[PDB]
Amino acid sequence: EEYVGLSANQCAVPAKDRVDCGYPHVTPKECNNRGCCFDSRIPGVPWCFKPLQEAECTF
Amino acid sequence: EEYVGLSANQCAVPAKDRVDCGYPHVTPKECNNRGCCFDSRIPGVPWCFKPLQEAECTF
């Protein structure tokens, strides 16, 4: 029931709680296509993780 | 909602409720590894989608 840190907001985490998708094709069109979320906001963190992938992932 | 209609059992869709991951490496090891679900049941259906991917997708 603790589906918050992995719900619609995780993709907005403080950039330091993701699973760093670590995709070699990370991109603002590939990650979201691979099942990850592209940050870009913080280049010091993973710009490709599995935050609120629920978008169309869990679907 | 109770992530169920999009979780377990979902990956067992009737073969016409997926989002056709449309992966270039669709396989029962790559998709389920990339964040998709490999069917193989029907060749006319997507043997790679995002059913109950929530497993290690949403996370």
Side-chain angles (χ1 to χ4, degrees):
Chain A
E1 60 282 293
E2 285 195 332
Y3 50 94
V4 56
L6 344 64
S7 70
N9 165 244
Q10 184 171 231
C11 182
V13 108
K16 37 125 74 196
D17 200 10
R18 311 140 166 200
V19 197
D20 153 75
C21 193
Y23 254 150
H25 227 110
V26 42
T27 241
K29 205 129 223 70
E30 261 70 297
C31 276
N32 268 229
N33 190 13
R34 306 234 132 183
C36 318
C37 208
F38 190 77
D39 146 71
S40 217
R41 319 207 119 186
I42 330 193
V45 325
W47 347 280
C48 189
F49 29 115
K50 274 120 225 196
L52 97 198
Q53 294 301 128
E54 259 147 330
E56 264 97 54
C57 226
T58 187
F59 229 117
Chain B
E1 290 140 318
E2 292 103 49
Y3 310 149
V4 297
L6 33 49
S7 181
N9 209 124
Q10 201 247 110
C11 172
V13 264
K16 31 142 76 140
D17 187 17
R18 315 141 180 212
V19 195
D20 151 64
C21 221
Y23 224 36
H25 316 115
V26 39
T27 232
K29 187 134 281 229
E30 257 142 35
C31 272
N32 264 240
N33 171 56
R34 87 86 115 170
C36 299
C37 203
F38 186 79
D39 173 70
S40 213
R41 288 230 80 71
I42 343 188
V45 109
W47 350 287
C48 188
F49 29 115
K50 51 246 309 234
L52 99 198
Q53 299 308 276
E54 152 166 306
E56 291 128 61
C57 203
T58 204
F59 224 48

Coordinates of all heavy atoms in Angstrom, one line a residue, chain A residues 3 5-7 10 19 23 31-35 50-54 56-59, chain B residues 3 6-7 10 17 19 21 23-24 33-35 50-54 56-59:
Chain A
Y3 N 2.6 2.6 -2.1 CA 2.9 2.9 -3.5 C 3.0 4.4 -3.8 O 2.1 4.9 -4.4 CB 1.8 2.3 -4.3 CG 0.4 2.6 -3.9 CD1 -0.2 3.7 -4.4 CD2 -0.2 1.9 -2.9 CE1 -1.6 4.1 -4.0 CE2 -1.5 2.2 -2.4 CZ -2.1 3.3 -3.0 OH -3.4 3.6 -2.5
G5 N 6.6 6.2 -3.3 CA 7.9 6.4 -3.8 C 8.2 5.7 -5.1 O 9.3 5.8 -5.7
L6 N 7.1 5.0 -5.6 CA 7.2 4.3 -6.9 C 6.0 4.6 -7.7 O 5.7 3.9 -8.7 CB 7.4 2.8 -6.6 CG 7.9 2.4 -5.2 CD1 6.8 2.8 -4.2 CD2 8.3 1.0 -5.2
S7 N 5.3 5.7 -7.3 CA 4.1 6.1 -8.0 C 4.4 7.4 -8.8 O 5.5 7.7 -9.1 CB 2.9 6.3 -7.1 OG 3.1 7.5 -6.2
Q10 N 7.8 9.5 -8.4 CA 9.1 8.9 -8.3 C 10.0 9.5 -9.5 O 11.2 9.6 -9.3 CB 9.1 7.4 -8.3 CG 10.5 6.8 -8.2 CD 10.4 5.3 -8.0 OE1 10.9 4.7 -7.1 NE2 9.6 4.7 -8.9
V19 N 16.8 3.7 -9.8 CA 17.5 2.4 -10.0 C 18.5 2.6 -11.2 O 18.9 1.6 -11.7 CB 16.6 1.3 -10.1 CG1 17.3 -0.1 -9.9 CG2 15.4 1.4 -9.2
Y23 N 20.8 2.7 -19.2 CA 20.6 2.3 -20.6 C 21.6 2.9 -21.5 O 21.9 4.1 -21.4 CB 19.2 2.7 -20.9 CG 18.2 1.6 -21.0 CD1 16.9 1.8 -20.7 CD2 18.6 0.3 -21.4 CE1 15.9 0.8 -20.8 CE2 17.6 -0.8 -21.4 CZ 16.3 -0.5 -21.2 OH 15.4 -1.5 -21.2
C31 N 14.2 5.9 -23.5 CA 14.0 5.4 -22.1 C 12.5 5.2 -21.8 O 12.1 4.1 -21.4 CB 14.6 6.4 -21.1 SG 16.4 6.2 -20.8
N32 N 11.8 6.3 -22.1 CA 10.3 6.2 -21.9 C 9.7 5.1 -22.8 O 8.6 4.7 -22.6 CB 9.7 7.5 -22.2 CG 9.6 8.4 -21.0 OD1 8.5 9.0 -20.7 ND2 10.7 8.5 -20.3
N33 N 10.5 4.7 -23.7 CA 10.1 3.7 -24.7 C 10.6 2.3 -24.2 O 10.0 1.3 -24.5 CB 10.7 3.9 -26.1 CG 10.0 3.0 -27.1 OD1 9.0 2.4 -26.8 ND2 10.6 3.0 -28.3
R34 N 11.7 2.3 -23.4 CA 12.3 1.1 -22.9 C 11.6 0.7 -21.6 O 11.6 -0.4 -21.2 CB 13.8 1.3 -22.7 CG 14.5 1.8 -24.0 CD 15.6 0.9 -24.4 NE 15.6 0.5 -25.8 CZ 16.4 -0.3 -26.4 NH1 17.4 -0.9 -25.7 NH2 16.2 -0.6 -27.7
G35 N 11.1 1.7 -20.9 CA 10.4 1.5 -19.6 C 11.1 2.3 -18.5 O 11.0 1.9 -17.4
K50 N 13.5 3.9 -13.4 CA 12.2 3.3 -13.4 C 11.4 4.0 -12.2 O 11.0 3.3 -11.3 CB 12.2 1.8 -13.3 CG 12.4 1.1 -14.7 CD 13.7 0.3 -14.8 CE 14.4 0.6 -16.1 NZ 15.4 -0.4 -16.4
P51 N 11.1 5.3 -12.4 CA 10.3 6.0 -11.4 C 8.8 5.6 -11.5 O 8.5 4.6 -11.0 CB 10.6 7.5 -11.8 CG 11.1 7.5 -13.2 CD 11.5 6.1 -13.6
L52 N 8.1 6.6 -12.0 CA 6.6 6.3 -12.2 C 6.3 5.7 -13.5 O 5.3 6.1 -14.2 CB 5.9 7.6 -11.9 CG 5.4 8.5 -13.1 CD1 5.1 9.9 -12.7 CD2 6.5 8.4 -14.2
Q53 N 7.2 4.8 -14.0 CA 7.0 4.2 -15.2 C 5.6 3.7 -15.4 O 5.1 3.5 -16.6 CB 8.0 3.0 -15.4 CG 9.4 3.5 -15.4 CD 9.6 4.4 -16.6 OE1 10.1 5.5 -16.4 NE2 9.2 4.0 -17.8
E54 N 4.9 3.6 -14.3 CA 3.5 3.1 -14.3 C 2.7 3.8 -15.5 O 1.8 3.2 -16.0 CB 2.8 3.5 -13.0 CG 2.7 2.2 -12.1 CD 2.8 2.6 -10.6 OE1 3.5 3.6 -10.3 OE2 2.2 1.9 -9.8
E56 N 2.9 4.0 -18.7 CA 2.5 3.0 -19.7 C 3.3 1.7 -19.5 O 3.4 0.9 -20.4 CB 2.6 3.6 -21.1 CG 1.3 4.1 -21.6 CD 1.2 5.6 -21.3 OE1 2.1 6.3 -21.8 OE2 0.2 6.0 -20.7
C57 N 3.9 1.6 -18.3 CA 4.7 0.4 -18.0 C 3.9 -0.6 -17.4 O 3.6 -1.7 -17.9 CB 6.0 0.8 -17.2 SG 7.5 0.0 -17.8
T58 N 3.4 -0.3 -16.2 CA 2.5 -1.2 -15.4 C 1.3 -1.6 -16.3 O 0.8 -2.7 -16.1 CB 2.1 -0.5 -14.1 OG1 1.5 -1.5 -13.4 CG2 1.1 0.6 -14.3
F59 N 0.8 -0.7 -17.1 CA -0.3 -0.9 -17.9 C -0.3 -2.3 -18.5 O -0.9 -2.6 -19.5 CB -0.2 0.1 -19.1 CG -1.5 0.8 -19.4 CD1 -1.5 2.2 -19.3 CD2 -2.6 0.2 -19.8 CE1 -2.6 2.9 -19.6 CE2 -3.8 0.9 -20.1 CZ -3.8 2.3 -20.0
Chain B
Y3 N -3.8 -2.4 -8.5 CA -3.0 -2.8 -9.6 C -3.1 -4.4 -9.8 O -2.3 -5.1 -9.2 CB -1.5 -2.5 -9.2 CG -1.4 -1.0 -8.7 CD1 -0.4 -0.7 -7.8 CD2 -2.2 0.0 -9.3 CE1 -0.2 0.6 -7.4 CE2 -2.0 1.3 -8.9 CZ -1.0 1.6 -7.9 OH -0.9 2.9 -7.5
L6 N -3.7 -4.8 -14.4 CA -2.5 -4.4 -15.2 C -1.3 -5.1 -14.7 O -0.2 -4.9 -15.2 CB -2.3 -2.8 -15.1 CG -2.8 -2.2 -13.8 CD1 -2.2 -2.9 -12.6 CD2 -2.5 -0.7 -13.8
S7 N -1.5 -6.0 -13.7 CA -0.4 -6.8 -13.1 C -0.6 -8.2 -13.5 O -1.1 -8.5 -14.6 CB -0.4 -6.7 -11.6 OG 0.6 -7.4 -11.0
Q10 N -2.4 -10.0 -16.4 CA -2.5 -9.1 -17.5 C -1.5 -9.6 -18.6 O -1.9 -9.5 -19.8 CB -2.1 -7.7 -17.0 CG -2.6 -6.6 -18.0 CD -1.4 -5.9 -18.7 OE1 -1.2 -6.1 -19.9 NE2 -0.7 -5.1 -17.9
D17 N -4.7 -6.7 -26.0 CA -4.9 -5.7 -25.0 C -3.5 -5.2 -24.5 O -3.4 -4.5 -23.5 CB -5.5 -6.3 -23.8 CG -5.9 -5.3 -22.7 OD1 -6.0 -4.1 -23.0 OD2 -6.2 -5.8 -21.5
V19 N 0.4 -3.4 -25.6 CA 0.9 -2.1 -26.2 C 2.0 -2.4 -27.2 O 2.8 -1.5 -27.6 CB 1.3 -1.1 -25.1 CG1 1.4 0.3 -25.7 CG2 0.3 -1.1 -24.0
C21 N 5.2 -3.9 -27.3 CA 6.4 -3.2 -27.0 C 7.2 -2.9 -28.3 O 7.9 -1.9 -28.4 CB 7.3 -4.1 -26.0 SG 8.1 -3.1 -24.7
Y23 N 9.8 -4.6 -29.8 CA 11.2 -4.6 -29.5 C 11.9 -5.3 -30.7 O 11.4 -6.3 -31.2 CB 11.4 -5.4 -28.2 CG 12.4 -4.7 -27.3 CD1 12.5 -3.4 -27.2 CD2 13.3 -5.6 -26.5 CE1 13.5 -2.8 -26.3 CE2 14.2 -5.0 -25.6 CZ 14.3 -3.6 -25.5 OH 15.2 -3.1 -24.7
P24 N 13.1 -4.8 -31.0 CA 13.9 -5.4 -32.1 C 14.6 -6.6 -31.6 O 15.2 -7.4 -32.4 CB 14.9 -4.3 -32.5 CG 14.9 -3.3 -31.4 CD 13.7 -3.6 -30.4
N33 N 13.6 -8.8 -19.8 CA 14.8 -8.3 -19.2 C 14.9 -6.8 -19.5 O 15.5 -6.0 -18.7 CB 16.1 -8.9 -19.8 CG 17.3 -8.2 -19.4 OD1 17.6 -8.0 -18.2 ND2 18.1 -7.8 -20.4
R34 N 14.2 -6.4 -20.6 CA 14.2 -5.0 -21.0 C 13.1 -4.3 -20.3 O 13.2 -3.1 -20.0 CB 14.0 -4.8 -22.5 CG 12.5 -4.8 -22.9 CD 11.9 -3.4 -22.8 NE 11.5 -3.0 -24.1 CZ 10.8 -1.9 -24.3 NH1 10.4 -1.1 -23.3 NH2 10.5 -1.5 -25.6
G35 N 12.0 -5.0 -20.0 CA 10.8 -4.4 -19.3 C 9.6 -4.8 -20.1 O 8.6 -4.1 -19.9
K50 N 4.1 -4.6 -22.4 CA 4.3 -4.2 -21.1 C 3.1 -4.5 -20.3 O 2.3 -3.6 -19.9 CB 4.7 -2.7 -21.1 CG 3.7 -1.9 -21.9 CD 4.4 -1.3 -23.1 CE 5.7 -0.6 -22.8 NZ 5.7 0.8 -23.3
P51 N 2.8 -5.8 -20.0 CA 1.7 -6.2 -19.2 C 1.9 -6.0 -17.7 O 1.7 -4.9 -17.3 CB 1.6 -7.7 -19.6 CG 2.9 -8.1 -20.1 CD 3.7 -6.9 -20.5
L52 N 2.3 -7.0 -17.0 CA 2.6 -6.9 -15.6 C 4.1 -6.5 -15.4 O 4.6 -6.9 -14.4 CB 2.2 -8.2 -14.9 CG 3.3 -9.2 -14.6 CD1 2.7 -10.6 -14.3 CD2 4.3 -9.2 -15.7
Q53 N 4.6 -5.8 -16.3 CA 6.0 -5.3 -16.2 C 6.2 -4.6 -14.9 O 7.4 -4.6 -14.4 CB 6.4 -4.4 -17.4 CG 6.2 -5.2 -18.7 CD 6.9 -6.5 -18.7 OE1 8.1 -6.6 -19.0 NE2 6.2 -7.6 -18.4
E54 N 5.2 -4.1 -14.3 CA 5.2 -3.4 -13.1 C 6.2 -4.1 -12.1 O 6.8 -3.5 -11.3 CB 3.9 -3.3 -12.4 CG 4.0 -3.2 -10.9 CD 2.7 -2.7 -10.3 OE1 2.2 -1.6 -10.7 OE2 2.2 -3.4 -9.4
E56 N 9.3 -5.4 -12.4 CA 10.6 -4.7 -12.3 C 10.6 -3.5 -13.3 O 11.7 -3.1 -13.7 CB 11.8 -5.7 -12.5 CG 11.9 -6.7 -11.4 CD 12.0 -8.1 -11.9 OE1 12.9 -8.4 -12.7 OE2 11.1 -8.9 -11.5
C57 N 9.4 -3.1 -13.6 CA 9.3 -1.9 -14.5 C 9.0 -0.7 -13.7 O 9.8 0.3 -13.7 CB 8.3 -2.2 -15.6 SG 8.5 -1.3 -17.1
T58 N 7.8 -0.7 -13.1 CA 7.4 0.4 -12.3 C 8.5 0.8 -11.2 O 8.8 1.9 -11.1 CB 6.0 0.1 -11.7 OG1 5.4 1.4 -11.4 CG2 6.1 -0.6 -10.3
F59 N 8.9 -0.3 -10.6 CA 9.9 -0.1 -9.5 C 10.9 1.1 -9.9 O 11.0 2.0 -9.1 CB 10.7 -1.4 -9.5 CG 11.0 -1.9 -8.0 CD1 10.0 -1.9 -7.1 CD2 12.3 -2.3 -7.7 CE1 10.3 -2.4 -5.8 CE2 12.5 -2.7 -6.4 CZ 11.5 -2.8 -5.5

